[PDB]
């Protein structure tokens, strides 16, 4: 019956500032050590800092002790973390933890996305295999959904008729501030010439719809 | 700045015991380092396990035990279960701060190991009109998650230009899928000829390479 509710975060442009909150209910918050940790995409856990029950001594990681400020209000049963003048690699899932012989109680975590990009529709390129000669080695086709922003994008195949074996991967935030995504389907190699495969990309934030037919090379 | 080191990944079977180690660069791990162990299950499900070397957070089963093995801190999962398959992070207290480790991907075998089917996708012509070219490599329906994909352009091992993405574990057959995208400038892509994707997986006796040559078929 212990719950740490987080709020704040979201998209923030580089050089901006954000303040996350963590409201604890179900424990005597006043007598609990508190800490902030974050999980970046592709990285491991990173310890940001910790704060005493009475805020007597506050400990930050030496690397990022100038970016973040940890604070708490025992009267409100709330813990705060303010990041000032963020950078592109500050995009991560920030978690609110309370010590009890360890990292005992966690929050749900708030995502912070740092990117200076404006909303841009994706480019859909076909991932097609060269003309197969092997004995019907199950073939793989897909679409590459490149250079789009913000995150929500939906890929379907043959207007939703094709679902068996479809793998649409999570997007990855490129170094350019834009996202990139891959959708893949496996089909019998015997049917590559006879059956037409079409991926349907939908980027609602940009009012973009792309239907791209994937066929192998001429050779 | 000190570096904390843990095993890249481990693999065990239900019922067996597994031991994860955690090495400090400053020297031998001491009880004064107050080793902590944190567990991340799929979908960013973090749960604390052990703190202060051997104290475990209350309500964590007894099969998780923290100790000191020689120069390193150790987390031992005795009688592991499939629910214990997760990524285990280590934290060492350095007087005034914690330093987290890279993390150990512990695998507890739910099913027979399955080797990935590897495919390689050259860049489209329409994309080449844009000035950049991306080669995609797909690993399909494999278990466990731990896999290594490496890019070789004319036998030159590439680094810094590839990004990986992994699907969630299928609840039915517990398999994964991997997409590694290697991005190049149209200039660099048309300079070289042979593009290869070398996959290393537990279900493979020898790493398999799937390649193609630019402008050929």
């Amino acid at each position: 019956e212990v719950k740490l509710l987080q709020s704040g975060g979201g998209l923030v442009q580089p050089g901006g500032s954000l303040k996350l909150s963590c409201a604890a209910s179900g424990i005597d918050f006043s007598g609990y050590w508190m800490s902030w940790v974050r999980r970046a995409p592709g990285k491991g856990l990173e310890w940001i800092g910790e704060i005493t029950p009475d805020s007597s001594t506050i400990n930050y990681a030496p690397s990022l002790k100038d970016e973040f400020i940890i604070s708490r209000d025992n009267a409100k049963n709330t813990l705060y973390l303010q990041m000032t003048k963020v950078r592109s690699d500050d995009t991560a899932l920030y978690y609110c933890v309370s010590y009890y012989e360890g990292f005992a109680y966690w929050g749900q975590g708030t995502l912070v996305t740092v990117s200076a990009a404006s909303t841009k529709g994706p480019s859909v390129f076909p991932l097609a295999p060269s003309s197969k000669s092997t004995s019907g080695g199950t073939a793989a086709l897909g679409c590459l959904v490149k250079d789009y922003f913000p995150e929500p994008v939906t890929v379907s195949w043959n207007s939703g008729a094709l679902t068996s074996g479809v793998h649409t991967f999570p997007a990855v935030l490129q170094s350019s501030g834009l996202y990139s995504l891959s959708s893949v389907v496996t089909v019998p190699s015997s049917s590559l010439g006879t059956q037409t495969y079409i991926c349907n990309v939908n980027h609602k934030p940009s009012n973009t719809k792309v239907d791209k037919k994937v066929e192998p090379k001429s050779c | 700045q000190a570096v904390v080191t843990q095993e890249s990944a481990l693999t065990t079977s239900p019922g067996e015991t597994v031991t994860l180690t955690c090495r400090s660069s400053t020297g031998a791990v001491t009880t004064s380092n107050y080793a902590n162990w944190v567990q991340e299950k799929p979908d960013h499900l973090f749960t604390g396990l052990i703190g202060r070397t051997n104290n475990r957070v209350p309500g964590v089963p007894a099969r998780f035990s923290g100790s000191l093995i020689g120069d390193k801190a150790a987390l031992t999962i005795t009688g592991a279960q499939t629910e214990d398959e997760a990524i285990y992070f280590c934290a060492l207290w350095y007087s005034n701060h914690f330093i987290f480790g890279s993390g150990t991907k512990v695998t507890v075998l739910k099913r027979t190991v399955a080797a990935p089917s590897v495919f390689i996708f050259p860049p489209s012509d329409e994309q080449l009109k844009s000035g950049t070219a991306s080669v995609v490599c797909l690993l399909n329906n494999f278990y466990p998650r731990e896999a290594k994909v490496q890019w070789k352009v004319d036998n030159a091992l590439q680094s810094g230009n590839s990004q990986e993405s992994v699907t969630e574990q299928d609840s039915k057959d517990s398999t994964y899928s991997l997409s590694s995208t290697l991005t190049l400038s149209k200039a660099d892509y048309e300079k070289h000829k042979v593009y290869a994707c070398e996959v290393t997986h537990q279900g493979l006796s020898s790493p398999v390479t799937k390649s193609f040559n630019r402008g050929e078929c």
Partner: peptide, 9 residues
């Protein structure tokens, strides 16, 4: 009174 034990002393 007492407060919850932290992960480091």
């Amino acid at each position: 009174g007492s407060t919850a034990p932290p992960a480091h002393g």
